[PDB]
Design a protein around this ligand. Structure first.
Ligand SMILES: CS(=O)(=O)NCCc1ccc(F)cc1
Ligand SMILES: CS(=O)(=O)NCCc1ccc(F)cc1
Ligand SMILES: [Cl-]
Ligand SMILES: [Cl-]
Ligand SMILES: [Cl-]
Ligand SMILES: [Cl-]
Ligand SMILES: [Mn+2]
Length: 340
């Protein structure tokens, strides 16, 4: 039977089921005020699916010059055509290869660049912005988005949205690598999964995805969406409460020292965006510092709401297209204030 919502992550994660319901705010706002992330399912059913295909991006924009990142070793591939990324998104035999002869796991850096999404892609901009959940919070001019209303005493987000495109991580060794390393943002954000590409070539790669979700500490209800409903899983997130950010800095300064890094005692390993918390480091955070987090699997059409100041990391299970909008809720405006 159809329901307004469910509770995931041992009752700590709200999952809203109807992305456009005019009553969603009544369920959302108490979870949000407590500094929790929120998930909203079903946004893909509201969008024009033809606008969000990898082959369309290659056809329309493929002669633009871009830089790529090799997710395995952080090497930068400079000044290549964006078609060289898009044409290997789902077809493994078309992917750029490393010196060892293997196909690379690539991330497309800063594309569209800076604030240019709306100018470059006006039909995509309209389709996303008109279908964002919790629109009083997430639209540029929503009544509960303070972004356009604050003075210079507050850090204001850039004009959005921003697109995040990267291949899926594949191997047992890849389990310890991030798509996006641990970091935080001083603004709130909503991140929508608009497309998931499950390949052919090395295709039949299902078992390493299940071990990644299990070892990732997914809850048993999330482990049912995999097996029961046959939805496409895109990415595994870990999110930590803003109140636990300094305890995470203390762990990563200790581990940096154990690994012979030579950092000053006040340096900021979260701002550096250089760490991915693997199973070993997540268990040490829990056991040695008493800090737990939310393990979230983002399926096609899921919107993840990330509270301002909350440390988070992302690991793609399959090839993903994500689109994110930043906003400034009144609940979390303290995190962007420039004094005290
Ligand atoms: C430019 S590179 O990143 O150093 N790679 C070496 C070139 C290559 C690697 C694998 C091939 F199947 C063909 C050529
Ligand atoms: C591993 S999980 O299935 O995501 N459940 C964790 C929920 C939780 C989140 C944050 C906390 F500070 C304490 C508990
Ligand atoms: Cl907060
Ligand atoms: Cl467009
Ligand atoms: Cl709303
Ligand atoms: Cl990163
Ligand atoms: Mn972020």
């Amino acid at each position: 039977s159809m329901t307004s919502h469910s509770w995931l992550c041992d009752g700590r994660l709200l999952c809203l089921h109807d992305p456009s319901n005019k009553n969603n705010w009544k369920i959302f706002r108490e979870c949000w005020k407590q500094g929790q992330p929120v998930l909203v399912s079903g946004v893909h059913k509201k969008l024009k699916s033809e606008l969000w295909k990898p082959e369309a991006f290659s056809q329309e924009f493929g002669d633009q010059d871009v830089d790529l990142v090799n997710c395995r070793n952080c090497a930068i591939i400079s000044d290549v055509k964006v078609r060289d990324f898009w044409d290997g998104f789902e077809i493994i035999c078309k992917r750029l290869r490393s010196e060892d002869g293997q196909p690379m796991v690539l991330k497309l850096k800063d594309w569209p660049p800076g604030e240019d999404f709306r100018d470059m892609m006006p039909t995509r901009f309209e389709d996303l912005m008109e279908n964002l959940p919790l629109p009083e919070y997430t639209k540029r001019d929503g009544r509960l988005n303070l972004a356009s209303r604050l003075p210079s005493y507050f850090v204001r987000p850039d004009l959005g949205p921003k697109m995040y495109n990267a291949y899926g991580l594949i191997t047992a060794e890849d389990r310890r690598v991030g798509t996006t390393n641990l970091h935080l943002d001083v603004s709130d954000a909503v991140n929508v999964m608009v497309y998931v590409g499950i390949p052919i070539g090395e295709g039949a790669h299902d078992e390493e995805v299940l071990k990644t979700i299990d070892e990732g500490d997914a809850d048993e209800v999330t482990k049912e969406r995999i097996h029961d409903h046959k939805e496409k899983p895109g990415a595994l997130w870990h999110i930590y409460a803003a109140k636990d950010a300094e305890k995470i800095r203390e762990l990563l300064r200790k581990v940096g020292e154990e690994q012979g890094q030579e950092n000053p005692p006040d340096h900021d390993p979260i701002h550096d965006q250089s760490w991915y918390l693997d199973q070993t480091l997540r268990k040490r955070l829990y056991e040695e510092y008493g800090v737990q987090g939310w393990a979230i699997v983002q399926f096609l059409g899921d919107a993840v709401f990330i509270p301002a100041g909350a440390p988070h990391q992302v690991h793609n299970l399959y090839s993903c297209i994500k689109v994110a909008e930043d906003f400034v809720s009144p609940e979390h405006v303290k995190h962007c204030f420039r004094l005290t």
